[PDB]
Structure 1
Amino acid sequence: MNIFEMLRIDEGLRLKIYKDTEGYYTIGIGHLLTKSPSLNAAKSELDKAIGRNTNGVITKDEAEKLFNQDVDAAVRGILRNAKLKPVYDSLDAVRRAALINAVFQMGETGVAGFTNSLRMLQQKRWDEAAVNLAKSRWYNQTPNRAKRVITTFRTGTWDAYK
């Protein structure tokens, strides 16, 4: 089990443009295309990303390539982030996977705002941070995914995923 298999489980794989849980235009493995309501805009963003006239449909290889770029962007944001870097550095390999997940899903700014939970994570107060991570819009909108991620922060194992 690794970050790639993990996110692949949480995001699934779709070869045609689709709408996410928030109603946004997405494609592949959670690759958000635009917050815009226009399918045209979405189509245009996808063609830009792939480098071709896609017609709103991509192939497996293509989805995987976006996915690779996105995981890499995610890690890089955490390391560049003044609030994130430190938490990340202090954690073990599994728990690091869970922070990358959360970022991939909510953006760095987004995760960087969870001030209190970050602090508890850093202090290694597992049960405490889990509860705190639970009091969020994130947990209320996507309860099952959040449950999995939070369980990973709490335990330090892949149990929620096996």
Structure 2
Amino acid sequence: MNIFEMLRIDEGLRLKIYKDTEGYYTIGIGHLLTKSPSLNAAKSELDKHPAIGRNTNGVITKDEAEKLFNQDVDAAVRGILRNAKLKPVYDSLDAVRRAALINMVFQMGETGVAGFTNSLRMLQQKRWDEAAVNLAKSRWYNQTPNRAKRVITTFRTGTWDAYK
């Protein structure tokens, strides 16, 4: 396991336009196409992404999916490295826990995760179970419980147990 395999589990692989946890048009492996309510709007965006740049009509191959996936993951890592509150945290975690942090940014963006103040602090001080206890009481946790549980278990143990 690693970040890719982990996110593929959390996000699933959908070759056709779908709606996310929030009601937004996404495709593949969690690739948000557009916050607009229009499926046409969505198809448009899709047809225009450089990795695709063709006429899909809401349908992509398994390759294009992974290609967007790769980019999205990199984008996540960038957001982290470019965020002042996040970077310090990342630098301080091990290879497995780093995957947990990337998962949160991938899911919710750099800005959202940056606002997990108390939890980031506990993570920086290596207080696993407290970090865990603390994350479990967020709205993120109530919103996507299944996912959140595995991520938290990841921070807590520093093992892939929750995904195995």
Settle same-fold status: TM greater than 0.5.
yes
Compute the displacement of 1:57 (Å). 0.5
1:50 Cα deviation (Å)? 1.7
Per the TM alignment, residue 89 of structure 1 is displaced from its structure 2 partner at its CA by 0.2
Deviation at 1:137, TM superposition (A): 1.3
Distance 1:122 1:2 in 2: 21
**Pairwise CA distance, 1:134:** 1.2
Distance 1:151 1:80 in 2: 26
C-alpha distance in structure 2 between counterparts of 1:32 and 1:151, whole Å: 26
**Other-structure match for 2:37:** 37
Deviation at 1:148, TM superposition (A): 0.2
Q: Distance in 1 between matches of 2:114 and 2:104?
A: 10
Moved over 4 A (4+): none
- Residue aligning to 1:76: 78
Give the Å deviation of 1:79: 0.5
Q: Which runs of 5+ in 2 are unaligned?
A: none
The CA distance in 1 between the partners of 2:110 and 2:156, in whole Å, is: 21
1:37-56 per-position Cα deviation (integer Å, ceiling 9, x unaligned): 11111111111162112111
> Which residue pairs with 1:21 in the alignment?
21
Corresponding pairs, count: 162
More deviation in 152-161 or 43-52? 43-52
Task: Determine if the alignment matches structure 1 residue 156 to structure 2 residue 135.
Answer: no
Residues 29-78 of structure 1, C-alpha deviation per residue, up to 9 Å, x if partnerless?
A: 01011111111111111111621121110000000100000011111110
Taking the aligned partners of 2:70 and 2:126, their CA distance within structure 1 comes to 30
TM-score, normalised to structure 1, is 0.98
Rounded Cα–Cα distance in structure 2 between residues aligned with 1:109 and 1:80 = 11
- What is the distance in 1 between the residues matched to 2:83 and 2:54? 33
The alpha-carbon deviation at position 21 of structure 1 amounts to 1.4
Separation of aligned partners in 1, 2:110 and 2:21: 19
Structure 1: state its 5+ residue gaps: none
Offset from partner CA, 1:106-130 (integer Å, 9 cap, x none)? 0000100101100000000111111
State the Cα distance separating 1:23 from its structure 2 match: 1.0
Higher helix share: 1
Write the distance in 2 (CA, Å) between the matches of 1:141 and 1:41.
Answer: 26
TM-score by length of 2: 0.97
Question: 1:41 & 1:134 partners in 2: Cα distance?
Answer: 36
Residue in 2 that maps onto 1:105? 107
